[PDB]
Amino acid sequence: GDRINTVRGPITISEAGFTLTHEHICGSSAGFLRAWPEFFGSRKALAEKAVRGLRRARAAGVRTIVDVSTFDLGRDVSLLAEVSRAADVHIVAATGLWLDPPLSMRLRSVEELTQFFLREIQYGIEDTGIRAGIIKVAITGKVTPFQELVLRAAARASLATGVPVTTHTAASQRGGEQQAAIFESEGLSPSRVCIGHSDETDDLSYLTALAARGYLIGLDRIPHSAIGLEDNASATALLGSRSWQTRALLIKALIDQGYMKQILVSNDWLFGLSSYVTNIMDVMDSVNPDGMAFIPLRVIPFLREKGIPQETLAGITVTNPARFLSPTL
Amino acid sequence: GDRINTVRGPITISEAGFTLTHEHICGSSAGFLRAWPEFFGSRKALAEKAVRGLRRARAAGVRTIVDVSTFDLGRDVSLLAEVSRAADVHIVAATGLWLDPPLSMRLRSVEELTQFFLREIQYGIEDTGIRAGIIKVAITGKVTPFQELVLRAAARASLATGVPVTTHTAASQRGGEQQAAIFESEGLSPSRVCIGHSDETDDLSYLTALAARGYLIGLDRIPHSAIGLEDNASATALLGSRSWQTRALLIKALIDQGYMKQILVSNDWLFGLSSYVTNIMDVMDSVNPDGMAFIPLRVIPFLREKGIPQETLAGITVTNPARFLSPTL
Numbered sequence A, B: 001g002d003r004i005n006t007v008r009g010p011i012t013i014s015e016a017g018f019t020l021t022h023e024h025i026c027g028s029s030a031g032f033l034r035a036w037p038e039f040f041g042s043r044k045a046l047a048e049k050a051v052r053g054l055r056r057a058r059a060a061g062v063r064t065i066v067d068v069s070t071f072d073l074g075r076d077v078s079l080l081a082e083v084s085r086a087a088d089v090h091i092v093a094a095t096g097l098w099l100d101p102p103l104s105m106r107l108r109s110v111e112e113l114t115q116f117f118l119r120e121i122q123y124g125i126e127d128t129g130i131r132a133g134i135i136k137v138a139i140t141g142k143v144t145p146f147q148e149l150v151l152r153a154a155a156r157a158s159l160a161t162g163v164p165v166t167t168h169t170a171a172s173q174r175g176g177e178q179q180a181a182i183f184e185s186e187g188l189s190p191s192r193v194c195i196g197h198s199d200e201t202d203d204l205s206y207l208t209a210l211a212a213r214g215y216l217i218g219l220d221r222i223p224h225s226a227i228g229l230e231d232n233a234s235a236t237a238l239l240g241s242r243s244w245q246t247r248a249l250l251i252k253a254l255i256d257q258g259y260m261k262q263i264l265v266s267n268d269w270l271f272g273l274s275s276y277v278t279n280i281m282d283v284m285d286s287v288n289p290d291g292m293a294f295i296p297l298r299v300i301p302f303l304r305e306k307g308i309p310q311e312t313l314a315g316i317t318v319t320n321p322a323r324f325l326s327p328t329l
């Protein structure tokens, strides 16, 4: 209602400041960082890379990130707490399930998954005492049966705690409509929900219609735009063919439609990525050397020069995330 | 050959004693026990159940078990160390990959996987310093391209270290001939390989030809039987429709063919199982209350009653596992 849980404990809403609402310290798999830290050079090297990256974002104005790495993205909340303390950047951790659930998760009922998401919000993650402040879910296509169980569990956990739900939309086909239908069938308010990766489409009438229904629209992959990398087969299905300015103009378009309050922006960046081909992190870092500072260093000035006023940009990067993250029923 | 790695440190061959070569403390998924221990009631409840069960096996003569839980079966070597020490039963831990590799494993090359298995054998598991003493691999059907990479990396790791390889197939499946092809193409000696779950069929021709090639034959699911549970589809799918006596008669058949030295016997038991339907452990515990003591309490007397000499049975339960586990380049 007024305090948000972070990996260093509770903070008040006013302390969050400029908040990147969809980021990762490391995109990995459950148990992997512990079992094979040398994949990333070392745990130390990954930690140090993340502390520099977060200090760079901080110098560019960022005060909070939301790490939307779930259990099955290899979330290590102890790593997050360490790099949060060393960078002096708040990190909100997530519960939920992404697209790589192991069997022990895939074979669970909606009731069982609700208890798991609830334990991570109400009690803590693992034995750390660190509580999730957001629930992350993911869909592909028209939403599979298991993904629908996960969305319903996420809705039920949200209804019991007030923490919001944020999604990974992996579809070339108005992928939020089915997510909205499932959330609404559960009695969840759209204002507790961010439909993420909404910048992957140019379908403005679709985005506007979700915003008018009260959903938050995550324009959160703005720098995933590889202009010149058609020699790499795997760099096209993880970056793209539309320019970053094209994606950023969706922000202006929704503002002009009257829905600035429904917009959340971010980079979807990370400092390590083992859940993809080897050396992918080198390709990503060469295409976007700004990392998580891309939003404040590139996108905010781009929008300013297009005529968006300062107060509107503050509304999007400070006010909207605060309203979204503060637990509410 | 050499001393054997256990979760309490190196032991000599002579200390292994009566060894069960395919067992589990808990069948789960990477990260799962630490993220959701109350799935098993609690971590402490699971540890206490394991210690009670191991102590009953110990009373019945068992001195060593080989826990062939891999990374992706949720191996928690600190759990293994706790219950080994409290039950005072040696436990050999495993590296390798089973049938639920996350993205961070299944997008790796054969060289990368070789390095991961080597790390777990030569350096230690996670940050524990506990080294694996066996490499566990698993296949479905034909052997998939990824599974074939896993088998080649396991062979290379075995060649570099002398530690043996042991395998899983699905219910009623064979698969040994397809696995042996790959292992021999890498130059691995059959004397370093156990073709596990070989009690899943009654194809004696298949079993005897692998044994004649020097493979170890794992007759290691002896108590698994859903006979009398025909209305429970999940129990039947898991435990199968063959009696424990049918499975045990394969031990006698291979002895009768002259292959006593190729035989390894076990229960493939566990004290928790989250990588299957909920409450399955209740079904399994009612089928086989003896747990891991099933082999010494029931199968050994069964085979004695069939006329097999005590010395042959001692060779199978003590000498064969010692020859198999002792690292041999």
Ligand SMILES: C[As](C)(=O)[O-]
Pocket: B024, B027, B168, B268
């Ligand atoms: C954990 As099993 C029943 O696949 O050996």
Ligand SMILES: [Zn+2]
Pocket: A167, A168, A169, A197
């Ligand atoms: Zn995503």
Ligand SMILES: [Zn+2]
Pocket: A022, A023, A024, A068, A268
């Ligand atoms: Zn993401």
Ligand SMILES: [Zn+2]
Pocket: B167, B168, B169, B197
């Ligand atoms: Zn198995």
Ligand SMILES: [Zn+2]
Pocket: B022, B023, B024, B068, B268
């Ligand atoms: Zn097994």
